Design an enzyme around this catalytic site. Structure first.
Site, short mmCIF file in Angstrom:
data_model
loop_
_atom_site.label_atom_id
_atom_site.label_comp_id
_atom_site.label_asym_id
_atom_site.label_seq_id
_atom_site.Cartn_x
_atom_site.Cartn_y
_atom_site.Cartn_z
CB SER A 49 -31.40 -71.67 -12.01
OG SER A 49 -31.13 -70.61 -12.81
C1 LIG Z 1 -30.71 -70.97 -14.48
O1 LIG Z 1 -30.10 -72.03 -14.23
C2 LIG Z 1 -29.91 -69.87 -15.10
C3 LIG Z 1 -30.26 -69.50 -16.55
C4 LIG Z 1 -31.79 -69.85 -16.52
O2 LIG Z 1 -30.02 -68.38 -17.01
C5 LIG Z 1 -28.47 -70.42 -15.27
C6 LIG Z 1 -27.63 -69.03 -15.39
C7 LIG Z 1 -27.12 -68.57 -14.31
S1 LIG Z 1 -25.91 -67.36 -14.03
C8 LIG Z 1 -26.59 -65.87 -14.85
C9 LIG Z 1 -25.80 -65.99 -16.33
N1 LIG Z 1 -26.69 -65.02 -17.16
C10 LIG Z 1 -27.70 -64.76 -17.82
N2 LIG Z 1 -28.28 -66.04 -17.91
C11 LIG Z 1 -27.21 -69.96 -12.98
C12 LIG Z 1 -26.91 -69.55 -11.66
O3 LIG Z 1 -26.84 -70.37 -10.87
O4 LIG Z 1 -27.42 -68.32 -11.02
N3 LIG Z 1 -28.11 -70.63 -13.66
#
Ligand SMILES: *C(=O)[C@H]([C@@H](C)O)[C@H]1CC(SCCNC=N)=C(C(=O)O)N1
Length: 640
Positions: free
Chosen positions: A384
């Site tokens: 992300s």
């Molecule tokens: C990317 O932006 C991730 C997404 C691709 O999964 C999102 C979700 C997360 S938090 C973890 C949630 N559990 C499974 N996906 C964020 C983050 O800020 O880490 N961005």
């Protein structure tokens, strides 16, 4: 002229066999043993080359300027210049000469000892004396040792002075419990076939104070390579191993009695660190008086090598990973200095270079987390965090209005029904999402939509301004980062996935720190640098300066806002811009999906430092963010 044609062939077949080391095939092209013919028989020509060329480690004999003429009616004379490689360097411009023989329908060489080296007579000997070079040191940006030569405390036992019967078992248990050794392993050491009852059998190296020595225990000083940071820098530095006869065949200029780098910087900088062997190669009389010196020069010790690494940051970065799988890269993003290159889990390079058991080495190889991997140089999907790049690209080409608010309902979204059961998923159900909100909450659906709106052509145009496909000028083995497998996505889904750092993106942490440096240089990408003396190189106008001034204030909110994904870092009370991330992976292994956690963080006031940390295959409720406070505290204090 057909005779000199066959004579030229014979001389070059003779040289080829010598070059390849088949001395027997060379000797079988010589005339019978006589006064004006061959000075020796075939079997003693074999032993002459095998002993002399083997003693000097001759390799790569190649000739030039071959002239073959006629002397008598059946005697043709040849001459050529030649060069060869030995254990003391290249030996150039050698004037060889001799005669041939046309008897029946074949031509042979009247062999003489001057076809070993020029100006050898009958029974002259060859002498080689060598002094080994001392291996150079690897040191950090402040001169602290990272890999140095010096004296080590080696502990061992003599089986004779240990005692017999029940006296033996008491001392062996005393040794095993006084130095953290297996009682059954001390017996396996003294039971090896090479051991005689009076020999000193080494056991392990003592890297601290040495306690009371029970009966039969001894401590001897020995020279050897030493790594002060241990496992904290093993993947980067590497280790040296004992040189084998197969290494000497590949490069004769090594010291068959010394150490060669097997991995890491020790292997990447082996030529500079090992120096050059000194000594002299000479021809002597049948007596032993020196006739001619062929090669001579003094020993040159290896150069030291200064890294951009900070030894304190490297240790702190590695300790913070707590033995879990992951890596951390720290830079000063305005110059590109690599302050820390941590990879976890790791191996003990001191145990590695001082002789390791077969079981301990296999424990490293069978370990599923694979401690031998240099994770800072392994391509990963960035996650992300990559939303920053997509946003900056979207601001440059005018696709993204920072104040336009997308209306997102729920946690799942798809462009239309053609995507089937696939949907972009987000964590927080925020209805009104602008750019600042999408960065604070890390909203995939916003980024997936703005990426599809942008389109592939405009998206790649922005991505191509970075370092995809480029080979970084670093002494670290790595593959170039890639946008995807091919030059086009050919998939709306793959385009959206790439938008928030999933898809077929492969970027190693060092290449990530390079790309993310645009936010610390007003859109200028600054290439990473590991060797302290090298000059800073960069790449202007990667992203616009307007995009940087827009995104960095929002990256502060990722820390300061109460619902920011990195809000736990606001406890530090230091100026921080950050972006967290997550990459879901696995495909053809286990049914449960594995998750990678990412953190990007830098000082947005002075641009003094920058950090990219990751956890590979994270455990539950674990993240790079909850482990980064100590390194951020250090980098903020010492790199303004
Ligand atoms: C990317 O932006 C991730 C997404 C691709 O999964 C999102 C979700 C997360 S938090 C973890 C949630 N559990 C499974 N996906 C964020 C983050 O800020 O880490 N961005």
């Amino acid at each position: 002229t057909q005779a000199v044609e066959a004579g030229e062939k014979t001389v070059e077949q003779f040289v080829q066999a010598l070059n390849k080391g088949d001395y027997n095939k060379a000797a079988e092209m010589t005339s019978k043993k006589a006064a004006n013919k061959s000075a020796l028989s075939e079997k003693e020509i074999l032993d002459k080359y095998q002993n002399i060329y083997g003693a000097a480690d001759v390799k790569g004999l190649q000739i030039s300027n071959l002239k073959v003429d006629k002397k008598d009616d059946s005697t043709y004379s040849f001459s050529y210049k030649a060069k060869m490689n030995t254990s003391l360097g290249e030996l150039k411009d050698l004037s060889y000469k001799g005669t041939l023989d046309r008897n029946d329908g074949q031509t042979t060489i009247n062999w003489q000892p001057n076809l070993v080296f020029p100006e050898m007579e009958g029974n002259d000997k060859v002498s080689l004396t060598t002094q080994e070079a001392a291996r150079g040191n690897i040191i950090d940006r402040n001169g602290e040792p990272l890999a140095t030569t010096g004296k080590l405390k080696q502990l061992g036992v003599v089986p004779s002075k240990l005692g017999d019967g029940g006296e033996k078992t008491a001392n062996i248990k005393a040794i095993a419990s006084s130095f953290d050794l297996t009682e059954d392993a001390i017996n396996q050491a003294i039971s090896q076939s090479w051991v005689q009852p009076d020999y000193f059998v080494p056991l392990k190296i003592i890297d601290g104070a040495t306690p009371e020595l029970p009966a039969g225990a001894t401590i001897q000083e020995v020279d050897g390579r030493y790594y002060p940071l241990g496992e904290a820098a093993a993947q980067l530095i590497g280790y040296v191993g004992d040189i084998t006869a197969e290494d000497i065949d590949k490069n004769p200029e090594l010291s068959s009695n010394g150490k060669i780098g097997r991995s890491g910087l020790e292997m990447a900088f082996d030529k500079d660190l090992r120096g050059t062997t000194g000594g002299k190669l000479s021809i002597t009389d049948a007596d032993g008086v020196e006739k001619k010196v062929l090669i001579e020069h003094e020993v040159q010790n290896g150069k030291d090598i200064k890294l951009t690494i900070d030894a304190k940051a490297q240790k702190t970065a590695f300790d913070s990973l707590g033995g879990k799988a992951g890596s951390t890269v720290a830079t000063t993003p305005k110059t590109g200095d690599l302050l820390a290159l941590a990879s976890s889990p790791s191996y003990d390079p001191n145990k590695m270079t001082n002789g390791i058991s077969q079981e301990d080495y296999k424990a490293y190889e069978e370990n599923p987390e694979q401690p031998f991997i240099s994770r800072f140089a392994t391509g990963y999907a960035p996650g992300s965090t990559f939303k920053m790049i997509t946003a900056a690209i979207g601001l440059d080409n005018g696709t993204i209005d920072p104040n336009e608010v997308l209306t997102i309902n729920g946690l799942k979204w798809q462009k239309d029904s053609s995507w089937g059961s696939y949907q972009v998923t987000r964590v927080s159900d925020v209805s009104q999402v602008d750019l600042k909100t999408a960065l604070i909450y890390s909203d995939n659906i916003y980024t997936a939509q703005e990426t599809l709106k942008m389109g592939e052509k405009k998206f790649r145009t922005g991505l191509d301004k970075f370092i995809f496909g480029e080979d970084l000028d670093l002494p670290i083995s790595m593959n170039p980062a890639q946008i995807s497998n091919e030059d086009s996505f050919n998939s709306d889904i793959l385009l959206a996935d790439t938008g928030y750092g999933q898809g077929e993106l492969l970027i190693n942490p060092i290449q990530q720190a390079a790309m993310y440096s645009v936010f610390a240089n007003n859109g200028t990408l600054v290439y990473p640098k590991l060797i302290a003396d090298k000059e800073t190189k960069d790449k202007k106008n990667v992203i616009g300066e307007t995009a940087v001034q827009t995104i960095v204030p929002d990256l502060r909110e990722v820390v300061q806002d109460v619902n920011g994904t990195a809000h736990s870092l606001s406890a530090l009370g230091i100026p921080l811009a950050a972006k967290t991330g997550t990459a879901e992976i696995k495909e053809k292994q286990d049914v449960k999906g594995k998750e990678n956690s990412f953190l990007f963080a830098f000082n947005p006031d002075n641009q003094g430092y920058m950090m990219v940390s990751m956890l590979e295959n994270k455990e539950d409720d674990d993240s790079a963010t909850k482990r980064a406070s100590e390194l951020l505290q250090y980098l903020n204090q010492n790199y303004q």
